[PDB]
Amino acid sequence: DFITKNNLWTNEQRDAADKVLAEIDSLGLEMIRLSWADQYGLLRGKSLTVASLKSAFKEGSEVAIGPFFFDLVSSMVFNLFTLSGNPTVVMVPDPTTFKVLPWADKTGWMLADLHWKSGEPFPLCPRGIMKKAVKSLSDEGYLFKCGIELEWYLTKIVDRSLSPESLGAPGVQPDAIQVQPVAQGYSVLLEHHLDQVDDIMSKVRKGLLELNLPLRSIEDEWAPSQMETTFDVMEGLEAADAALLIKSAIKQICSRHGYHATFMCKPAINGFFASGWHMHQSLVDKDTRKNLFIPSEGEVLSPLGRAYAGGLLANGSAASSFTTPTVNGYRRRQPYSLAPDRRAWAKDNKAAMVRVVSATGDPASRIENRIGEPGANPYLYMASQIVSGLDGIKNKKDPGELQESPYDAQVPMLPTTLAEALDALEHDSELFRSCFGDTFIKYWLQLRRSEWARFLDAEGAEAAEPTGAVTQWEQKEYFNLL
Amino acid sequence: DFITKNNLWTNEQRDAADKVLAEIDSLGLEMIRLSWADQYGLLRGKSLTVASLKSAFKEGSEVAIGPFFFDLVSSMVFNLFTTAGDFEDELSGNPTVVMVPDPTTFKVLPWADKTGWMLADLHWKSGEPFPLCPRGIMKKAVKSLSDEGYLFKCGIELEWYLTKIVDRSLSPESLGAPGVQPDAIQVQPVAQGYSVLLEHHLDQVDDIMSKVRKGLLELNLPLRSIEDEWAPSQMETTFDVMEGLEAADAALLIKSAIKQICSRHGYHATFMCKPAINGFFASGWHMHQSLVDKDTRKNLFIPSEGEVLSPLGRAYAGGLLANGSAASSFTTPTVNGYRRRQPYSLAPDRRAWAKDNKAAMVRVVSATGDPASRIENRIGEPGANPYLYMASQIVSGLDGIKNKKDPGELQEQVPMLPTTLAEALDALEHDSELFRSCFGDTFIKYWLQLRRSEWARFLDAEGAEAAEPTGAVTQWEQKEYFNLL
Ligand SMILES: [Mn+2]
Ligand SMILES: [Mn+2]
Ligand SMILES: [Mn+2]
């Protein structure tokens, strides 16, 4: 009993486990998927039978850490045969995360944590970085509350790009899935585009509901075939696990019915505008459970929330590779685009990095950080916000002055390439090295700089210009998987 | 509770929400749409979960005002990125407003999967109503009307085209860009025409037409008639009399149901006045109107012998007429709506009153002592915004009442109506006081600002000559109104 010997379950998780086996038995489930988010947010793991799950509930399941050392295309940034080699770690199931996948045949699903065989936590496990952030927020008196609002694209699959000629090779991107848009229209919020796409959208809507996910709204975003699904507030690690499931389920559900959902920021398809992942955040007293961001008369935020906003602004440059992991996501670093090109904050202004949604006495007063990207890793994005903010609280960082025109603000600019965001983390190594782990940032810096290098040798430096056209390297790196 | 705090709900609005939630539960709905009419009459909004709509019945639901500052093809008319000091004097920014659900508008949409629908009113977070909300501008007319003792009784005669879809123009090179017109949906007529009212045309199109009829009927919309119009594939669908806000709400839902149902079975319904398709003539939205006494429920237009209308109805007609050029951009908001002059037809392009003459803007239907004595405005285009069309008639007609404006002798030197949306805006600019007073002064300057840009876009596309109303429908007009209106 690996799990019991190393004290990896709480009584809650233990009784959870007892019940997940009871649900498996009455539901007649034949497979149970066991997954974890890699460095990119992509769900990797194994599909177990129900005899093996019951054994994994004592021993765990062995997996190699090779995904962590590969890129999206499988090039070896780190040597796997010798930050090196391919040790084999234990997948430790978290029974509290179980869900009965409704688009699959008799298949359950539940997330896994990564552990060395000694029992200590694997230091690259992105979920572990969110646990670390949530634990430190619980030691300062706060619970992290997140409203998930996801902008993504919806397309019908023309060709799945399966011919041997299209398969690529480790380091050689495969062809993008061939798609076509489902609706046109730069008319935003049009009910007619909703009813047009609801043939497929009603299947995604029904799937989110069956997962007992707290779906809030389904909206026609601005661009042709661009969509917005928002969710009610969730708390802490739970919200990250839920973003994860939300993006996986949308993609899997669409594909079963012959559609392609992508969270790639800006697909290389004419008429497609950049997608954003704005992150609605507030803090709540771990005891009192009341928004500690609520302002008074004259305030747009409580002093606490003001401090949170300061560290969100202060650290957002080092944090950019986390809020915007992808190359392609930096075409959002632009003026006059409803996206943030500089560290500005404002009450009700979409051209800002931090947007305040608040009112005097309003228990829903909160911050909207808009430097986020839809394809971000939900554990690195949200822990970014937890680490960034709690720094502002701790160091009483004034956010400065609410900006009436963020695109004229003389505030510090945000990075405009993924190279720049990596540079900014190198020269502000601390805080993220104290919180994410020194080993992680060394790893993170080395791996992501390798992918920048591949974009550069494929497209050149002048293609990196954010206003530029979306390159084919972006399409054949992010469209299929993200 | 946002809605109790600013008392945005009467008790009836509260006796409804309780049963709105009750049949949501009874029927097992999973989505409720919350929609609102933008400057164009086009239904914007969100689709909310049950759990989430239960919240909006207390706190509302937020939404940006971008549609109001965007064109049909989403050019940015007003700077969206600079927050405003007095928004109503600079018109800049993307403020978040609250959508206040109105339960008296609840419907289960027949053609959709387990999905409900209601209308929302746009309010500032301050609790005070947003100054451009067209449904608010209708709410205002109905008030000033009830504050003079009258209810608005409205009869709708709505013409439109029903066509089969050949291509939805979804290829990426068709999608357009912000400010760029997307390609028009490719279509095919469904019947031949130039054989007006032909029963066999009706039976010919009833495969989908019955699906529209049935959908309108399930919505409890008071459908009066379906008729076969003159031009190929042109229909007219008329409705029984409706009152005040309900008639404009229904007008909106009428067009919404008609387009959504047709598209769901692969047809394209369009309220474009005159599509750029061979043989298609101009479609109209005629509005019969009368005033009733708000306490006796009785038609105040009914004429005695000697006069064609009562002196109340006669005054209204004068207010309909003396502001008709000003109001033109609210009864005929599209460039396309002015193409109405053709070699085989008569357009109501005269600002005049008549019983038989088809060129007069208003037709009178009145026999002595007849309880259905009324007037009929005919400059209405079908792709018109219902709130602003109806409120333009109440506002025009109340002027004539309060000022005893004389319409003059029935015309079978006739003053003419604006021939273009440019001229229509010229007319409103130079005679703005009554609309600035009753529609809001910020709305009128926002309206003239928005549409004058829509005209320069059209002019920049096809040139001054093709802008002439007599001329053929250009490609700018097709790619501006065909798909959305
Ligand atoms: Mn959005
Ligand atoms: Mn007719
Ligand atoms: Mn008529």
XYZ file of N, CA, C and O in Angstrom, chain A residues 94-172:
316
model
N -6.582 10.448 -7.323
C -7.337 11.338 -6.453
C -8.824 11.061 -6.653
O -9.437 11.628 -7.579
N -9.455 10.247 -5.789
C -10.832 9.778 -6.048
C -11.881 10.875 -5.998
O -12.980 10.713 -6.568
N -11.579 11.972 -5.309
C -12.501 13.082 -5.223
C -12.773 13.706 -6.581
O -13.800 14.372 -6.734
N -11.897 13.483 -7.572
C -12.003 14.096 -8.895
C -12.760 13.249 -9.913
O -12.809 13.633 -11.088
N -13.340 12.119 -9.500
C -13.992 11.184 -10.421
C -15.149 11.839 -11.181
O -15.849 12.713 -10.671
N -15.340 11.410 -12.422
C -16.471 11.825 -13.237
C -16.783 10.677 -14.189
O -15.884 9.937 -14.603
N -18.057 10.525 -14.539
C -18.481 9.508 -15.498
C -18.589 10.183 -16.869
O -19.586 10.842 -17.173
N -17.572 10.022 -17.713
C -17.568 10.693 -19.019
C -18.804 10.300 -19.825
O -19.022 9.100 -20.070
N -19.645 11.265 -20.229
C -20.919 10.917 -20.873
C -20.839 10.675 -22.369
O -21.802 10.133 -22.922
N -19.759 11.066 -23.052
C -19.637 10.847 -24.490
C -18.945 9.548 -24.843
O -18.880 9.198 -26.035
N -18.402 8.864 -23.838
C -17.650 7.634 -23.984
C -18.513 6.450 -23.574
O -19.505 6.589 -22.854
N -18.117 5.274 -24.025
C -18.847 4.060 -23.698
C -18.348 3.527 -22.361
O -17.204 3.071 -22.252
N -19.205 3.586 -21.344
C -18.969 2.912 -20.061
C -17.576 3.205 -19.477
O -16.935 2.340 -18.870
N -17.128 4.458 -19.609
C -15.791 4.893 -19.216
C -15.880 5.951 -18.119
O -16.558 6.968 -18.283
N -15.205 5.706 -16.996
C -15.014 6.717 -15.982
C -13.725 7.483 -16.212
O -12.986 7.227 -17.161
N -13.462 8.442 -15.318
C -12.353 9.383 -15.457
C -12.032 10.006 -14.111
O -12.936 10.356 -13.347
N -10.745 10.191 -13.848
C -10.347 10.726 -12.559
C -8.884 11.136 -12.655
O -8.108 10.501 -13.367
N -8.514 12.210 -11.966
C -7.179 12.744 -12.180
C -6.161 12.031 -11.287
O -6.514 11.356 -10.317
N -4.873 12.214 -11.613
C -3.770 11.574 -10.899
C -2.671 12.576 -10.569
O -2.385 13.482 -11.363
N -2.048 12.394 -9.402
C -0.881 13.148 -8.965
C 0.400 12.328 -9.181
O 0.400 11.100 -9.053
N 1.506 13.015 -9.486
C 2.750 12.343 -9.856
C 3.733 12.367 -8.687
O 3.990 13.426 -8.098
N 4.283 11.191 -8.363
C 5.140 10.976 -7.201
C 6.342 10.121 -7.567
O 6.205 9.118 -8.279
N 7.509 10.496 -7.046
C 8.641 9.582 -7.076
C 8.295 8.296 -6.323
O 7.388 8.263 -5.486
N 9.042 7.223 -6.613
C 8.797 5.964 -5.907
C 9.102 6.063 -4.411
O 8.521 5.313 -3.615
N 9.985 6.981 -4.009
C 10.195 7.230 -2.585
C 8.934 7.760 -1.915
O 8.716 7.528 -0.718
N 8.091 8.455 -2.671
C 6.878 9.042 -2.149
C 6.836 10.552 -2.171
O 5.745 11.125 -2.012
N 7.971 11.220 -2.352
C 7.969 12.672 -2.419
C 7.320 13.160 -3.713
O 7.155 12.374 -4.647
N 6.834 14.411 -3.750
C 6.133 14.884 -4.953
C 7.085 15.071 -6.124
O 8.184 15.600 -5.951
N 6.642 14.656 -7.307
C 7.386 14.939 -8.516
C 7.403 16.442 -8.788
O 6.343 17.069 -8.836
N 8.577 17.055 -8.960
C 8.660 18.526 -8.994
C 8.250 19.164 -10.311
O 8.275 20.395 -10.409
N 7.864 18.403 -11.328
C 7.407 19.020 -12.563
C 5.890 18.993 -12.715
O 5.366 19.663 -13.608
N 5.172 18.260 -11.832
C 3.727 18.048 -11.860
C 3.011 19.386 -11.723
O 2.946 19.945 -10.619
N 2.461 19.932 -12.814
C 1.876 21.281 -12.731
C 0.768 21.386 -11.710
O 0.663 22.403 -11.021
N -0.057 20.349 -11.583
C -1.063 20.328 -10.529
C -0.424 20.550 -9.163
O -1.014 21.206 -8.295
N 0.788 20.018 -8.955
C 1.452 20.184 -7.670
C 1.828 21.621 -7.394
O 1.836 22.058 -6.238
N 2.139 22.371 -8.450
C 2.362 23.812 -8.354
C 1.101 24.570 -7.919
O 1.199 25.562 -7.188
N -0.095 24.108 -8.319
C -1.341 24.731 -7.857
C -1.661 24.351 -6.417
O -2.172 25.185 -5.655
N -1.397 23.096 -6.030
C -1.532 22.715 -4.625
C -0.625 23.568 -3.742
O -1.041 24.038 -2.674
N 0.619 23.781 -4.186
C 1.568 24.587 -3.427
C 1.048 26.002 -3.226
O 1.141 26.558 -2.120
N 0.498 26.598 -4.293
C -0.066 27.946 -4.222
C -1.291 27.998 -3.315
O -1.432 28.923 -2.506
N -2.191 27.025 -3.445
C -3.389 27.010 -2.616
C -3.021 26.792 -1.153
O -3.650 27.364 -0.256
N -1.996 25.971 -0.880
C -1.597 25.762 0.511
C -1.073 27.055 1.129
O -1.513 27.458 2.214
N -0.145 27.729 0.441
C 0.370 29.000 0.935
C -0.736 30.047 1.082
O -0.699 30.883 1.992
N -1.749 30.051 0.235
C -2.839 31.037 0.439
C -3.632 30.660 1.687
O -4.202 31.557 2.303
N -3.633 29.386 2.061
C -4.431 28.932 3.226
C -3.673 29.255 4.500
O -4.257 29.150 5.582
N -2.401 29.598 4.363
C -1.553 29.878 5.543
C -1.505 31.391 5.733
O -0.875 31.841 6.696
N -2.134 32.140 4.830
C -2.166 33.619 4.944
C -3.601 34.038 5.233
O -3.818 35.218 5.548
N -4.543 33.103 5.113
C -5.889 33.430 5.511
C -6.915 33.566 4.402
O -7.981 34.149 4.647
N -6.649 33.021 3.215
C -7.441 33.312 2.035
C -7.772 32.041 1.278
O -7.030 31.055 1.312
N -8.891 32.084 0.573
C -9.262 31.054 -0.380
C -9.399 31.717 -1.741
O -9.953 32.818 -1.848
N -8.886 31.061 -2.781
C -8.888 31.626 -4.129
C -10.156 31.239 -4.862
O -10.474 30.051 -4.952
N -10.866 32.255 -5.362
C -12.166 32.029 -6.033
C -12.050 32.426 -7.506
O -11.653 33.558 -7.774
N -12.385 31.507 -8.418
C -12.199 31.771 -9.869
C -13.466 31.614 -10.708
O -14.168 30.612 -10.534
N -13.723 32.586 -11.583
C -14.812 32.477 -12.566
C -14.200 32.152 -13.919
O -13.446 32.987 -14.430
N -14.494 30.980 -14.474
C -13.872 30.521 -15.708
C -14.699 31.045 -16.879
O -15.892 30.728 -17.011
N -14.068 31.865 -17.718
C -14.687 32.392 -18.930
C -13.754 32.071 -20.089
O -12.643 32.616 -20.160
N -14.200 31.191 -20.989
C -13.347 30.615 -22.017
C -13.873 31.001 -23.386
O -15.029 30.694 -23.703
N -13.017 31.654 -24.194
C -13.269 31.965 -25.605
C -12.547 30.960 -26.490
O -11.333 30.779 -26.369
N -13.269 30.332 -27.402
C -12.653 29.288 -28.204
C -13.334 29.246 -29.565
O -14.304 29.972 -29.810
N -12.817 28.400 -30.459
C -13.321 28.336 -31.828
C -14.009 27.003 -32.115
O -13.687 25.969 -31.526
N -14.952 27.029 -33.049
C -15.833 25.895 -33.302
C -15.876 25.647 -34.794
O -16.343 26.504 -35.550
N -15.394 24.483 -35.224
C -15.268 24.209 -36.653
C -15.696 22.780 -36.956
O -15.637 21.905 -36.091
N -16.144 22.550 -38.188
C -16.516 21.216 -38.656
C -15.325 20.606 -39.387
O -14.662 21.284 -40.185
N -15.032 19.347 -39.092
C -13.815 18.735 -39.606
C -14.006 18.364 -41.068
O -14.960 17.665 -41.422
N -13.098 18.818 -41.921
C -13.153 18.469 -43.335
C -12.330 17.200 -43.564
O -12.841 16.194 -44.062
N -11.058 17.234 -43.181
C -10.141 16.111 -43.297
C -9.329 16.033 -42.015
O -8.826 17.053 -41.543
N -9.173 14.823 -41.481
C -8.523 14.597 -40.196
C -7.003 14.502 -40.277
O -6.359 14.359 -39.226
N -6.434 14.585 -41.481
C -4.992 14.666 -41.704
C -4.262 13.426 -41.198
O -3.225 13.509 -40.535
N -4.790 12.261 -41.583
C -4.319 10.963 -41.126
C -3.454 10.222 -42.135
O -2.895 9.182 -41.779
N -3.338 10.702 -43.370
C -2.503 10.026 -44.358
C -1.075 9.919 -43.841
O -0.585 10.859 -43.205
N -0.388 8.788 -44.071
C 1.021 8.671 -43.641
C 1.866 9.887 -43.965
O 2.717 10.270 -43.154
N 1.614 10.524 -45.115
C 2.354 11.707 -45.550
C 2.227 12.871 -44.576
O 3.086 13.766 -44.578
N 1.178 12.887 -43.756
C 0.889 14.003 -42.866
C 1.352 13.780 -41.430
O 1.187 14.677 -40.600
N 1.957 12.633 -41.125
C 2.192 12.258 -39.737
C 3.392 12.964 -39.126
O 3.515 12.988 -37.895
N 4.258 13.561 -39.940
C 5.432 14.210 -39.376
C 6.402 13.205 -38.778
O 6.596 12.100 -39.293
N 7.031 13.599 -37.681
C 8.101 12.842 -37.046
C 8.491 13.579 -35.782
O 8.239 14.784 -35.673
N 9.095 12.885 -34.803
C 9.526 13.591 -33.581
C 10.357 14.810 -33.928
O 11.441 14.680 -34.492
N 9.837 15.996 -33.634
C 10.426 17.255 -34.050
C 9.834 17.833 -35.323
O 10.038 19.024 -35.608
N 9.104 17.026 -36.088
C 8.519 17.438 -37.357
C 7.013 17.458 -37.149
O 6.374 16.401 -37.119
